[PDB]
Design a protein around this ligand. Structure first.
Ligand SMILES: Nc1nc2c(ncn2[C@@H]2O[C@H](COP(=O)(O)OP(=O)(O)OP(=O)(O)O)[C@@H](O)[C@H]2O)c(=O)[nH]1
Ligand SMILES: [Mg+2]
Lengths: 1026, 173
């Protein structure tokens, strides 16, 4: 457009164009323009000069962007080096900061005139206060509780000030500000808060100014987070909030979220005020909400100011009712509102928005719990506490059954090879909701199965003739039925099932058309799968359900085939015992027939389903404990895949070109992906299978990894994204998942190392090297740490052969930045963690020249920004220092040629604002290193005592990289590293407490670190190591 | 059409850019390359009532590459806050990202996302995510790799801005 890289920004003043930058950053800038616009502005911030900002506003340009930017420039100067400005300049700022505040905050027409700018100046002023408020400028508060009582244009702004000052000292002190200083600033406000609460109580009782009061109110919610209890309960504050503000539209939400905080405290002392608060408010809600009004429609169509209130109320009720179930039951004169509130938590308990229904549910689960802890028995005598709730419990029991959540969270995702598969998400929020409703409902069933069974069946009778019918409805119900599984006695369950599964069967007759008969059959299959106990007793019935599943296998109608395999593997697991042993009134065990007729059950199944089906049978083959038999059940098991396998092996053994046909390579990926499943079930006894195809399975993996490499070279790396090199890429990877898989569940390490490892040494590792970098499968590293973590000592001797093949070549890919080959990054250091933590004796049997390249690699690890890789490195370092402290021989040798350097690297990481994540590992290691200095090392790092050397070495190392640190805070810090060197919780805090000091030029001398306070805290810790 | 300034913030390595990239080109970035200052890419989904355009302001998470932190928030219609369900740290700092944000824009539709919900070993257990409650925010459980609740953060914002709680993404031309 206009601006080019040549931009003047030194020894000159071009104000009129600075605007064209921000108006080109927050505006016109479509890309190339703002990418620079931000850079040129970014590099103008650290360019040392505070005074430079004066002209930005003095010669203002109506660009609140530039002014806000100039404000950041000033805030920067204050947050970094306020201690090195001579007093003449401090006042030059102070007087000017507050000056440009009043001359714009008192201006009545400054309503829309930048609510942001007005706020910034406040933050800047609060920043000055943080740098110095109790020290110098002690009048401040008194100068507000006197200057605010002038105009309301001032009073309204001084409130958003103290709101922020409170947020910076109490809410957001930790981390942003030093430790002992926070305590100074904290009890500094708590010291003269009585003088400002007078003005608060004042503006609420009198002032008619709406915005002002709203501020006085909003900016008060923050105080409730720390202020002494007295200012609340021991005064007419709880009262003035309900009577005067709770009912009005605008102060509606503000006052509610204040009460919600007050009610969150323990009731044990001010039992009277909590009582009055409850009733006084519960009635005030009756004058704001008809106790009958449809809440869901008040939310379905209501402005933001309305919607939020409903949520906050949901909070207040969940807060009070849960934290005062005591004061509400005993006090008989309060049962009045206890039910009037329980009802409110019931009307709002039916809004569409989940985030509100999770607040209510949170309480219902609590209530159902407390009444269950009392007596976990059904309605037989009479329950004591349940009386008050029996009525509500039924309304809740309905709420659950009415709005149950889908239990099985399923999603179809495409992976790296383009192929699409179905995943069942694990601990998501959605699949967590079902677990909270299930629990809530399974409580209110053990309290009365009748009432629940009534709602259940009445919902069902209406799901047939009662035309309460709907696809979503039939689903929602069968989620509720398959929910309270095993919640009742096996007898009351027997009639409940045959009642339901027969009405749905008759319902499956009425409803015609493959479309509706599917959704019905599905919700029957699922109900069954959720009731294992039932299926085990009635074999004849079970023998049918499975057979009818072998029927749905052939139903080409969408969804059905998937449900058939899902609902099948569900049963195959929980009832694995019945398929293997002979059944009474049966020729032979069932599993047998299933294997003799497997070529007809998967006749027309999608490949993805054939796999799932096998995995299902795998579990059944597993339940058969006896070896002799289980071995034949596998040779028959993997009978079809081994025909195709031997077919391709044979077909290819003559002219090895077969492995270049898109079809026959896709099939090999389908066979392995099956073996991976069967193995993922059968377990160790699956070895007989793996060992059969093993040598062949590797001979092909090798033949493919070559054709990939060759394809990558001669044709480039863009062949790695084409159909064929995708299928081959899967066959390769799966072979690894089968191997890495089985070993995970193997139980004979020696036999594994003797028979299965050697082939890999040649066919997998030596090939992982020959491969051109952009073809090396990283899964090879993972599938290696897995067999090391497993084998351990039995592969210790083969480590040299492993590293010699996959170490230096993999490391020459990831040492040129912190980005490329991400998978190879993580997989590598996971492998290193394996060897180090198990086969440590393998690091000793290798030359100190190789080991140096290894310890040098671990440092490279925890210097990553990859939060996971950076952690893997720290994990090894700590486990390294521990394994070394076993053999004093190589131990002392290690402390010699490394200790100092390591302690230097682990420090380059700590003082970096990009590794604060895995900080807990820092403090953990730094502590172990400094505790090891008080005894461990028995030699000499250099000339000198020995500890004394480190206490200085570290100091003179910090003082150098951070010269702006006075030799006091550096001495004190290094001291603490020995004091709380055995208290990692505080140690961790003492480090962050240092990372705060290095961010500011604390000046040559000031004595604001409060030595005598941070010192009697380190001696208070050093004396606690006893 | 109509476009809004979406502000995407959150701790580093969280997955903020990997997310935008998946919406922008359907590509999944497997590597971590900390975005500097702020990269702004336009994201367009169309609804049943016409196409919407989100000029996303993907910001920097790492303190080092902050840039003009709160300066990017100015003139924003909506916002997003993101953390990593595998790093308890990324969550712990949500109140902070929130703070500086609501100080600039004191009233805007805000979404809260937890990325990497596809990773088996979830660290930030879902039953402990309750910051958005009292702050009147909305929350989802996205997964930039699997696409779990892929568009739900946007779909939700689409409504809160237009005023139509019936808005739907379709995949039209
Ligand atoms: N396994 C898994 N990894 C993910 C997922 N989403 C994101 N990631 C990882 O997260 C990283 C994303 O990096 P970035 O987009 O730069 O994250 P960021 O927080 O925006 O970085 P900055 O903006 O510089 O602070 C990638 O390396 C991904 O591997 C996910 O859904 N599953
Ligand atoms: Mg980014």
């Amino acid at each position: 457009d206009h601006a080019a890289r040549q931009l003047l920004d030194f020894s000159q003043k071009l104000d009129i164009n600075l605007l064209d930058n921000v108006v080109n950053c927050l505006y016109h800038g479509e890309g190339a323009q703002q990418r620079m616009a931000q850079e040129v502005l970014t590099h103008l911030k650290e360019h040392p000069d505070a005074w430079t900002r004066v002209d930005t506003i003095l010669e203002f340009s109506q660009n609140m962007n530039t002014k806000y930017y100039g404000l950041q420039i000033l805030e920067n100067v204050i947050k970094t080096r306020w201690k090195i400005l001579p007093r003449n300049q401090c006042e030059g700022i102070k007087k000017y900061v507050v000056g440009l505040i009043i001359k714009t905050s008192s201006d009545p027409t400054c309503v829309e005139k930048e609510k942001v700018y007005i706020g910034k100046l406040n933050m800047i002023l609060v920043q000055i206060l943080k740098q110095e408020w109790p020290k110098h400028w002690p009048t401040f508060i008194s100068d507000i509780v006197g200057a605010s009582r002038t105009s309301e244009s001032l009073c309204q702004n001084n409130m958003v000030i103290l709101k922020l000052l409170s947020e910076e000292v109490f809410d957001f002190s930790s981390g942003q500000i030093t430790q002992v200083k926070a305590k100074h600033l904290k009890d500094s406000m708590c010291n003269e808060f009585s003088q400002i609460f007078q003005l608060c109580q004042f503006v609420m009782e009198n002032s008619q100014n709406a915005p002002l009061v709203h501020a006085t109110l909003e900016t008060l919610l923050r105080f409730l987070n720390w202020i002494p209890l007295g200012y609340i309960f021991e005064t007419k504050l709880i009262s003035t909030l309900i009577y005067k503000f709770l009912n009005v539209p605008m102060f509606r939400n503000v006052s509610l979220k204040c009460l919600t905080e007050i009610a969150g405290v323990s009731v044990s002392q001010y039992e009277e005020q909590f009582e009055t608060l409850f009733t006084l408010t519960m009635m005030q809600l009756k004058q704001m909400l008809p106790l009958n009004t449809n809440i869901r429609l008040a939310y379905s169509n209501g402005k933001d100011d309305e919607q939020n209130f409903i949520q906050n109320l949901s909070l207040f009720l969940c807060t009070f009712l849960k934290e005062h179930g005591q004061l509400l039951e005993k006090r008989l004169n309060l049962r009045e509102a206890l039910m009037e509130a329980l009802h409110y938590m019931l009307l709002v308990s039916e809004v569409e928005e989940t985030e509100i229904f999770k607040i209510c549910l949170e309480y219902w689960n609590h209530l159902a719990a407390e009444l269950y802890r009392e007596s976990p028995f059904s309605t037989s005598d009479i329950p004591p506490r349940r009386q008050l709730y029996l009525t509500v419990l039924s309304k809740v029991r309905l709420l659950m059954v009415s709005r149950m959540a889908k239990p099985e969270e399923v999603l179809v995702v495409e992976n790296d090879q383009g192929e699409v598969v179905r995943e069942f998400m694990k601990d998501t929020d959605s699949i967590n909701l079902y677990k909270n409703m299930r629990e809530t409902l399974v409580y209110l069933t053990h309290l009365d199965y009748v009432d629940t069974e009534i709602i259940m069946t009445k919902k069902l009778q209406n799901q047939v003739n009662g035309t309460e019918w709907s696809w979503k409805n039939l689903n929602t119900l069968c989620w509720a039925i398959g929910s309270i599984s095993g919640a009742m006695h096996e007898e009351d369950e027997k009639r409940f099932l045959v009642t339901v599964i027969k009405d749905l069967l008759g319902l499956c007759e009425q409803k015609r058309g493959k479309d509706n008969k599917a959704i019905i059959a599905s919700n029957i299959m699922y109900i069954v799968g959720q009731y294992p106990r039932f299926l085990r007793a009635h074999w004849k019935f079970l023998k049918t359900v499975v057979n009818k599943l072998f029927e749905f296998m052939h139903e080409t109608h969408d969804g059905v085939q998937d449900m058939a395999c899902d609902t099948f593997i569900k049963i195959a697991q929980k009832c694995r015992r019945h398929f293997v042993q002979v059944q009474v009134g049966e020729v032979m065990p069932f599993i047998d027939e299933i294997l003799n007729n497997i070529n007809t059950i998967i006749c027309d199944l999608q490949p993805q389903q054939v796999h799932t089906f096998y995995e299902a049978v795998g579990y059944m083959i597993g339940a058969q404990t006896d070896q002799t038999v289980q071995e034949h059940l596998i040779e028959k098991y993997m009978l079809l895949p081994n025909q195709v396998w031997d077919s391709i092996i044979q077909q290819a053994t003559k002219n090895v070109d077969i492995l270049k046909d898109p079809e026959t390579v896709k099939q090999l990926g389908s066979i392995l992906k099956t073996n991976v499943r069967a193995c993922k079930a059968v377990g160790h006894p699956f070895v007989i299978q793996l060992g059969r195809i093993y040598l062949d399975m590797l001979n092909v993996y090798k033949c493919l990894s070559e054709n990939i490499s060759a394809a990558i070279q001669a044709n480039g790396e863009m062949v790695t994204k084409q159909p064929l090199i995708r299928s081959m890429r899967t066959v390769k990877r799966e072979t690894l998942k089968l191997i890495s898989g089985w070993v995970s569940r193997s139980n004979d390490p020696q036999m594994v190392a003797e028979n299965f490892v050697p082939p890999l040494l040649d066919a997998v590792l030596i090939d992982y090297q020959r491969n051109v970098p952009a073809a090396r499968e990283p899964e090879v590293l993972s599938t290696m740490a897995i067999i090391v973590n497993k084998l351990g000592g039995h592969i210790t001797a083969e480590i040299p052969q492993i590293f010699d093949a996959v170490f230096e070549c993999t490391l020459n890919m990831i040492n040129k930045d912190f980005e490329e080959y991400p998978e190879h990054r993580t997989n590598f250091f996971l492998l290193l963690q394996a060897v180090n933590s198990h086969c440590f004796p393998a690091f000793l049997a290798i030359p100190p020249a190789q080991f140096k390249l290894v310890l040098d690699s671990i440092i490279w690890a925890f210097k990553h920004t990859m939060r996971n890789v950076a952690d893997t490195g720290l994990q090894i370092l700590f486990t390294l220092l521990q394994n070394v402290a076993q053999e004093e021989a190589a131990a002392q040798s290690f402390y010699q040629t490394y200790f100092c350097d390591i302690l230097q690297h682990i420090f380059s990481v700590v003082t970096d604002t990009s590794h604060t994540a895995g900080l807990t590992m820092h403090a953990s290691i730094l502590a172990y290193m400094f505790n090891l200095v008080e005894e461990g090392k028995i030699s000499t790092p250099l000339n000198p005592n020995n500890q004394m050397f480190i206490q200085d070495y570290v100091a003179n190392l910090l003082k150098s990289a951070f010269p702006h640190l006075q030799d006091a805070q550096v001495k004190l810090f290094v001291t603490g590293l020995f004091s709380l060197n055995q208290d990692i919780p505080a140690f961790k805090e003492h480090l962050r407490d240092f990372l705060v000091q290095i961010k500011e030029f604390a000046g040559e001398d000031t004595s604001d670190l409060f030595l005598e306070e941070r010192e009697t805290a380190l001696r208070q810790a050093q004396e606690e190591k006893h | 059409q109509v476009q809004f300034k979406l502000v995407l913030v959150g701790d580093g390595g969280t997955g903020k850019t990997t997310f935008v990239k998946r919406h922008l080109t359907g590509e999944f970035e497997k590597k971590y390359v900390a975005t500097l200052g702020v990269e702004v890419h336009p994201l367009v989904f169309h609804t049943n009532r016409g196409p919407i355009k989100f000029n996303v302001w993907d910001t920097a998470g790492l303190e080092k590459f902050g840039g003009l932190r709160d300066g990017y928030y100015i003139q924003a219609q909506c916002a997003i806050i993101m953390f990593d369900v595998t790093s308890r740290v990324t969550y712990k700092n949500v109140p902070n990202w929130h703070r500086d944000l609501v100080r600039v824009c004191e009233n805007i539709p805000i979404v809260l996302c937890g990325n990497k919900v596809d990773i088996k070993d979830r660290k930030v257990k879902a039953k402990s995510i309750v910051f958005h409650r009292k702050k009147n925010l909305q929350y989802y459980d996205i997964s930039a790799k699997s696409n779990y609740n892929f568009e739900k953060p946007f779909l939700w914002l689409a409504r809160k801005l237009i005023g139509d709680p019936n808005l739907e993404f379709v995949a039209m031309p």
